[PDB]
Design an enzyme around this catalytic site. Structure first.
Site, PDB file in Angstrom:
ATOM      1  N   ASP A 120       0.777  -1.328   0.052  1.00 23.84           N
ATOM      2  CA  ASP A 120      -0.083   0.071   0.069  1.00 23.84           C
ATOM      3  C   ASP A 120       0.822   1.257   0.023  1.00 23.84           C
ATOM      4  O   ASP A 120       0.545   2.384  -0.692  1.00 23.84           O
ATOM      5  CB  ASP A 120      -0.851   0.016   1.131  1.00 23.84           C
ATOM      6  N   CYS A 142      -1.912   0.570 -13.516  1.00 24.58           N
ATOM      7  CA  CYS A 142      -2.116   0.672 -12.097  1.00 24.58           C
ATOM      8  C   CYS A 142      -3.266   1.754 -12.002  1.00 24.58           C
ATOM      9  O   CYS A 142      -4.408   1.512 -12.431  1.00 24.58           O
ATOM     10  CB  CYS A 142      -0.600   1.112 -11.715  1.00 24.58           C
ATOM     11  N   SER A 143      -3.149   2.525 -11.026  1.00 25.62           N
ATOM     12  CA  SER A 143      -4.310   3.424 -10.979  1.00 25.62           C
ATOM     13  C   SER A 143      -4.003   4.690 -11.880  1.00 25.62           C
ATOM     14  O   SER A 143      -5.134   4.818 -12.690  1.00 25.62           O
ATOM     15  CB  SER A 143      -4.200   4.268  -9.456  1.00 25.62           C
ATOM     16  N   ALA A 144      -3.283   5.441 -11.806  1.00 23.80           N
ATOM     17  CA  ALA A 144      -2.802   6.340 -13.201  1.00 23.80           C
ATOM     18  C   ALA A 144      -2.151   5.891 -14.211  1.00 23.80           C
ATOM     19  O   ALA A 144      -2.207   6.908 -15.304  1.00 23.80           O
ATOM     20  CB  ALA A 144      -2.113   7.510 -12.419  1.00 23.80           C
ATOM     21  N   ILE A 194       0.994   5.261 -14.651  1.00 25.08           N
ATOM     22  CA  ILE A 194       2.430   5.989 -14.872  1.00 25.08           C
ATOM     23  C   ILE A 194       3.509   5.673 -13.639  1.00 25.08           C
ATOM     24  O   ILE A 194       4.657   5.368 -14.109  1.00 25.08           O
ATOM     25  CB  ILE A 194       2.570   7.520 -14.823  1.00 25.08           C
ATOM     26  N   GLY A 195       3.029   5.161 -12.605  1.00 26.32           N
ATOM     27  CA  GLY A 195       4.104   4.938 -11.506  1.00 26.32           C
ATOM     28  C   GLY A 195       4.530   3.359 -11.660  1.00 26.32           C
ATOM     29  O   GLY A 195       5.650   2.997 -12.110  1.00 26.32           O
ATOM     30  N   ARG A 196       3.625   2.657 -10.769  1.00 27.10           N
ATOM     31  CA  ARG A 196       3.885   1.305 -11.108  1.00 27.10           C
ATOM     32  C   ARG A 196       3.977   0.617 -12.471  1.00 27.10           C
ATOM     33  O   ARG A 196       4.812  -0.241 -12.610  1.00 27.10           O
ATOM     34  CB  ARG A 196       2.835   0.212 -10.211  1.00 27.10           C
ATOM     35  N   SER A 197       3.260   1.082 -13.377  1.00 22.42           N
ATOM     36  CA  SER A 197       3.229   0.864 -14.502  1.00 22.42           C
ATOM     37  C   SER A 197       4.485   1.164 -15.419  1.00 22.42           C
ATOM     38  O   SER A 197       4.852   0.248 -16.271  1.00 22.42           O
ATOM     39  CB  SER A 197       1.794   1.468 -15.643  1.00 22.42           C
ATOM     40  N   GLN A 224       7.013   7.778 -10.607  1.00 21.15           N
ATOM     41  CA  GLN A 224       6.441   8.770  -9.743  1.00 21.15           C
ATOM     42  C   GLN A 224       7.334   8.997  -8.425  1.00 21.15           C
ATOM     43  O   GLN A 224       6.913  10.218  -8.023  1.00 21.15           O
ATOM     44  CB  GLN A 224       5.016   8.508  -9.411  1.00 21.15           C
TER      45      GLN A 224
END
Ligand code: ZD5
Ligand code: ZD3
Length: 281
Positions: free
Chosen positions: A181, A215-217, A219-222, A262
């Protein structure tokens, strides 16, 4: 300078934040006019995460072609990816329309639908075989065929049908279910095993359309997933794997979508993943 030696230096000096801010300062900026049209407000999860106009994926139904999704085309590595946001309740049909039109074989998901009490992504696939989903707006039907739940990720077999033609396609859903998380995984071993399963499925091959990663946006984990996969491909292709500069690759990817990676922790984790994954190849 092997990447390992560089990483040791960065870690000792505590400079991950400085290197990350340098990337932000150097990153491309291109227009996102379509994303910003009034009528597309409800198609964006985050007002500050938009696809560039030049690389955005266009939906082919006339109407409104907009989806928050970007084609990342890595020319030297010879791989493409579509990076997108986690679908909204009103954009799940657009998401599957995208997967259909782009001829994607794989979807990679790196979040959970709910994290820290809060909705990150709509439940855009069926949880039960007997309870299929119909997206009435884009005339698509989606059925869960099977799933293989493991400790760190789940692989699902989905059937996507174009109700206009009755054509069907198998889509593989790779769901990394254990990203923490807060922060990043302590070890990249499970992320790497995940990546290797995607690879081995054939979902990243050039005979299909680009894999869809979110992922959510988106851009980060993706960004970690695509950055690690591309750097590993470049390592295997180049005569000298230690000429792969992960900061240069990330800057290249940022020509196609804003914001990829990110946080400084994400950048560190991407290094760690590429270091450990190179050890296996
Ligand atoms: C030994 C060391 C040296 C530099 C570091 N720099 C960052 C940064 F990238 F955030 F700046 C994060 C670190 N850590 C803490 C340990 N657990 C990790 C989370 O799994 C992340 C870290 C650790
Ligand atoms: C023999 C072999 C060949 C190519 C590979 N490619 C990847 C990756 F990541 F590129 F897909 C990951 C591998 N492994 C699997 C074993 N477990 C490791 C870490 O836990 C990662 C791997 C192993």
């Amino acid at each position: 300078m092997e990447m390992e030696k560089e990483f040791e230096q960065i870690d000792k000096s505590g400079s991950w934040a400085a290197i990350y801010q340098d990337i932000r300062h150097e990153a491309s900026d291109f227009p996102c006019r379509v994303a910003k049209l009034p009528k597309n407000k409800n198609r964006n999860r985050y007002r500050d995460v938009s696809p560039f106009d030049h690389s955005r994926i266009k939906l082919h139904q006339e109407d409104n072609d907009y989806i928050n999704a970007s084609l990342i085309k890595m020319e030297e590595a010879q791989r493409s990816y579509i990076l997108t946001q986690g679908p909204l309740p009103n954009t799940c049909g657009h998401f599957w329309e995208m997967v259909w039109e782009q001829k994607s074989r794989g979807v990679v998901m790196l979040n959970r639908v709910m994290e820290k009490g809060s909705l990150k992504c709509a439940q855009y696939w069926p949880q039960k075989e007997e309870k299929e989903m119909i997206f009435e707006d884009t005339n698509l039907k989606l059925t869960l065929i099977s799933e293989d739940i493991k400790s760190y990720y789940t692989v699902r077999q989905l059937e996507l049908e174009n109700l206009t033609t009755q054509e069907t396609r198998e889509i593989l859903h790779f769901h990394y279910t254990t990203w923490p998380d807060f922060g990043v995984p302590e070890s990249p071993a499970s992320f790497l095993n995940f990546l290797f399963k995607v690879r081995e499925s054939g979902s990243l091959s050039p005979e299909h359309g680009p894999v869809v990663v979110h992922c959510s946006a988106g851009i980060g984990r993706s960004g970690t997933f695509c950055l690690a996969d591309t750097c590993l491909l470049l390592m295997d292709k180049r005569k000298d794997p230690s000429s792969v500069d992960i900061k240069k690759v990330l800057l290249e990817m940022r020509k196609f979508r804003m914001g990829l990676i990110q946080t400084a922790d994400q950048l560190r984790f991407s290094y760690l993943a590429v270091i450990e994954g190179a050890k296996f190849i």
